[PDB]
Enzyme design. Sequence first.
Site, mmCIF file in Angstrom:
data_model
loop_
_atom_site.group_PDB
_atom_site.id
_atom_site.type_symbol
_atom_site.label_atom_id
_atom_site.label_comp_id
_atom_site.label_asym_id
_atom_site.label_seq_id
_atom_site.Cartn_x
_atom_site.Cartn_y
_atom_site.Cartn_z
ATOM 1 C CG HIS A 1 45.254 41.377 38.787
ATOM 2 N ND1 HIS A 1 45.967 40.476 39.748
ATOM 3 C CD2 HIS A 1 45.522 41.337 37.711
ATOM 4 C CE1 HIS A 1 46.965 40.228 38.736
ATOM 5 N NE2 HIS A 1 46.765 40.676 37.498
ATOM 6 N N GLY B 1 53.661 39.178 30.628
ATOM 7 C CA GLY B 1 52.287 38.817 30.706
ATOM 8 C C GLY B 1 51.953 37.342 31.487
ATOM 9 C CB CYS C 1 49.263 37.892 35.531
ATOM 10 S SG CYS C 1 49.532 39.285 36.649
#
Lengths: 286, 295
Positions: free
Chosen positions: B38, B140, B142
């Site tokens: 993503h 953040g 991810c």
Amino acid sequence: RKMAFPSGKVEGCMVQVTCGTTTLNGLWLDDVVYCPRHVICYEDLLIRKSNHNFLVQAGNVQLRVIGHSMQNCVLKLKVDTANPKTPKYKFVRIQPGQTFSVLACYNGSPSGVYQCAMRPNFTIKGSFLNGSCGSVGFNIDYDCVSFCYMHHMELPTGVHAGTDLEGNFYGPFVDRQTAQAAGTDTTITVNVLAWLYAAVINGDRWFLNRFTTTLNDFNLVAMKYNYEPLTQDHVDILGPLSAQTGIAVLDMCASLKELLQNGMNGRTILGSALLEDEFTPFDVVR
Amino acid sequence: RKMAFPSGKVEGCMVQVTCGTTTLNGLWLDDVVYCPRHVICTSENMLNPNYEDLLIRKSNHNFLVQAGNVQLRVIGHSMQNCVLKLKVDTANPKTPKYKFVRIQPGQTFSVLACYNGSPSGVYQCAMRPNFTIKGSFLNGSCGSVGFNIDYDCVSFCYMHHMELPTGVHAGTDLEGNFYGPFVDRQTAQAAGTDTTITVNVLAWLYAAVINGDRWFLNRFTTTLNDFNLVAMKYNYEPLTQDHVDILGPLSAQTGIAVLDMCASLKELLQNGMNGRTILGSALLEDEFTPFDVVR
């Protein structure tokens, strides 16, 4: 979750130190290895020692001791070569209630990392394996390692005792086989308050009430439940969190006073059914 | 203490991957950077992303990869399930000995939480029976990865993709296949009911016996069927004959039959702790495995 600091910068400093039949961990920074002086089991004992009495192993490599010296309860072994993996670092001394990470090591080899607080009785509730003597505690601030602890001893009650990196003991302990025991411990009030602020920031708000208490009134409830007394210094420290959440410190203290008498009553705070005291105000901001 | 693995071998693999306005963490092993697909999504794509359509429109130079102060040149890209795989110029000089493994619920591992490619903290973890992680993920994180380390070999088992509405975290193995029924899409997906990992609590009780604590033992035993009928009323996972077999060694070292420890747990669930602690905990701890206890 409690998080430990990434341990990579410290991992490259850990070595094995052997004197006679005794072996433990050492910290190799520039051309000096730091370790607990009880590796030589102190004024006499070290005069009779010479360099060839110490065997230092940095993984496969053996290091040559070219000098030795004592500083309080840590031995300082000068070696032939500098550690090319030496980080930027400082030696610091912490106070009860402050937190740090420990890299637990076995015979020079890092085994695991965990996050600690220095208890008010100056001990560390840690999980220390056989041969973790000389493991170190540290904080990392912007790629700078602050070394604050070196492990020396297990106390009969399971907890651990150590020195700063200049060899000064934390707590009323000595590095001899005397009978010693941790004093009675205490909950770190300012860290509980910080953890309740983090609960509020995370949406947990049921323990908030409408009342306010006084510093004096809270400290009587605090000692009745074995909690460190709260100071105006602690209040000022929690100021940013009181600004951030709109809950004043003495109003959070009323909340804490009610918790110490009713319990969470089937409720939880951040998932716990006990009040966590190993998160500092600084830890919560970060 | 629950301990995480020393994180150094993984810290040297963390990079920052940026595509357009989206930045997250990537994992740099040999000459491939792995990261969540993503990264190629914009705001207006989160609800119904068409990843094959979004990826066909990218070239190598759309992907900015940074290892500290150094930009890595991407010379190819490819998608495998929900992970993007970016071929770079340079094999990571700090690549450890490693393998990719897929784990099962109940298994434990360490997570190196990172922000924009820089490691920030490490913690120890269990894959919950509902296939989520009770993580501590900054804004953040991810692309942060989970791992075990055995004899200096790193097993990568988890890559973080998203936070669910209930606060927990969902992600994939390093082949891009999600754990659980989750998708890298902003839909109304929710974690199933979470249950306690029974075999881990029992292993830990055995660890309490080995450390001298025995206050919770009793004189009873139980059948496996009767144990599971009781435990499931407390949202405990059913215990299988494989779990029984797995606890065999600890039952050997302590002389306490597995179903005898089960009767003790039944009573602990009925009575609570009565203000006591078992190892150093006032809670029934389920994130240490049978394998962990021997260590």
